[PDB]
Amino acid sequence: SRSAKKGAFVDAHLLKKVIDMNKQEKKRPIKTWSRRSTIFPEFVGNTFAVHNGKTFINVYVTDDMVGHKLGEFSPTRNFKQHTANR
Amino acid sequence: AKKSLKVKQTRIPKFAVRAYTRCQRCGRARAVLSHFGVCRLCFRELAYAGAIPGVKKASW
Amino acid sequence: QSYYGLGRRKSSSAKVYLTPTQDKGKITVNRRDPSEYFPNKLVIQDMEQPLDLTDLKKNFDINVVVKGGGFTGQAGAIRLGIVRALLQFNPELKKILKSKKLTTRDKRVKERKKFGLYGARRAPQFTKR
């Protein structure tokens, strides 16, 4: 869907943080709100805490999740069972 | 909350798509006529008062 | 001695030029064969209706200019134009034409859509419960 000449998209604050934490050996979860950022190849191996709307859900990216959007692996609304009206 | 929203609308945002058109007389956000910059319920009042030149009732 | 007529119908003007000739009428619409201009859906008889019952053996050369409307509207316009030009040749046709009422503007035009209505006169579905 997204254009070709435009390419992918990251907020680049996430990109700077990812580069820094990749150069650092003792990585920890990266608390990010940018659900719009796509998972770049350099992201692989890190763990992110994405703001689902209320809390920060931890997602561990792999060599496979590369390409999708960062917030796509976390939800925003929860529904599990209805109740009988009558 | 209406005064703060009016003032924020006058103030320029940091993104182009952030900008929306509010009525200039009142502060109504939806149903704004860009030709006149006035919402429908104030356009009716101005037209009935004769403020807008050339805006007469239509018979078709 | 040519004759000129101006008919109208459903917002479609017509300019009909009647020329006296004795080598077949050879009706012509907008420099094109009527059988090709119209869908030839027998609407030709509609425009010939005032030129059939009285006469077309007089072999009037027909020069028609129509700009506007569809094809039935255009046919009605040229019918009215032919009649009105015929009023300029031997006004005795005026009585017979008036008898069957081919010399009156139809006056029927499309109404304007009204707000709250799905059209000129249709109304939304009404639910009571």
């Binding site: - | - | 869908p39 859906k41 027998l42 008889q45 509609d46």
Partner: protein, 155 residues
């Protein structure tokens, strides 16, 4: 509670066979306001009648409509329970209109190929007093004859 009788528009003579019934049945088989399509259907059916019956299409059509054309109508009048029917003589105009409506309705339901052949074969079948519109006319006639008793009381 209207106390006004509606006007009537001209029927217009047909510009091919000079028979108004042709224009009437064209308008009856009209759908989506397509005069050209309706006229094509009728004239193709009449040409098929030429090809089959080897007789005059207008004469065959008149023989069909006159035979299908009913005589009595049963008007529903409820008083306490169900409805007791009332046989009344119909005007000629409504008689012809009902004949054409039945012809078209039973023509657009037959099992055959293109509607051209559909209506053509329906007309040729109704020309010999054996058809579906014939069955409809027979049914209403028999129902009126059964309920002949209440003909005196209408309203």
């Amino acid at each position: 509670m209207r106390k006004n009788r509606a006007p009537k528009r001209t029927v217009l003579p047909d510009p091919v066979f000079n028979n108004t019934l042709v224009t009437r049945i064209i308008n009856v088989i009209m759908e989506d306001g397509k005069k050209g399509l309706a006229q094509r259907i009728l004239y193709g059916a009449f040409d098929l009648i030429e090809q089959r019956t080897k007789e005059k299409p207008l004469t065959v059509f008149e023989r069909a409509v006159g035979n299908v054309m009913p005589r009595l109508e049963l008007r529903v009048r409820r008083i306490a329970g169900s409805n007791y029917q009332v046989p009344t003589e119909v005007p000629q105009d409504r008689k012809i209109a009902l004949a054409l409506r039945w012809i078209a309705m039973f023509a657009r339901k037959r099992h055959e190929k293109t509607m051209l052949e559909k209506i053509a074969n329906e007309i040729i079948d109704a020309s010999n007093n054996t058809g579906a519109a014939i069955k409809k006319k027979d049914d209403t006639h028999k129902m009126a004859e059964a309920n002949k008793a209440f003909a005196h009381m209408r309203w």
